Lon protease (Meiothermus taiwanensis), 125 residues
Amino acid sequence: LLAAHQAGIHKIVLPKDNEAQLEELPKEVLEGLEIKLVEDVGEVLEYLLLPEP
Amino acid sequence: LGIPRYRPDKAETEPQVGTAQGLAWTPVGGTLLTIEVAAVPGSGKLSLTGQLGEVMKESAQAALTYLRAHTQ
């Protein structure tokens, strides 16, 4: 999250197996993110190959 | 402590389609060599991964032979 936060990236993709690991994060690191909580590679490719047609 | 980084005494793993939870003895301690296998389509072949010896290869081949002895 830090490496996506310093590089000016906003919407990050993390595995939902880290959702319980997400609440570890403080309320300042999660300032300005929108994690597309995913568990299947198919959904990452659905929400990232979005300009498919 | 932190969150429970490992699940409780394993009864909540919810059996998956392909992976077989096989045990073995790595030199750094115990583990389960979950032999996660890919039932890919195609035209018939067999490969491996992990950069291991062929012993895994003939073990898999003999396994496949026993399956083909019990196809239907």
About this structure: The radius of gyration of chain A is 12 Å. Helices of chain A lie at 2-5, 19-22, 41-46. The longest helix of chain A spans residues 41-46. Chain A is about 25% helix and 0% strand.
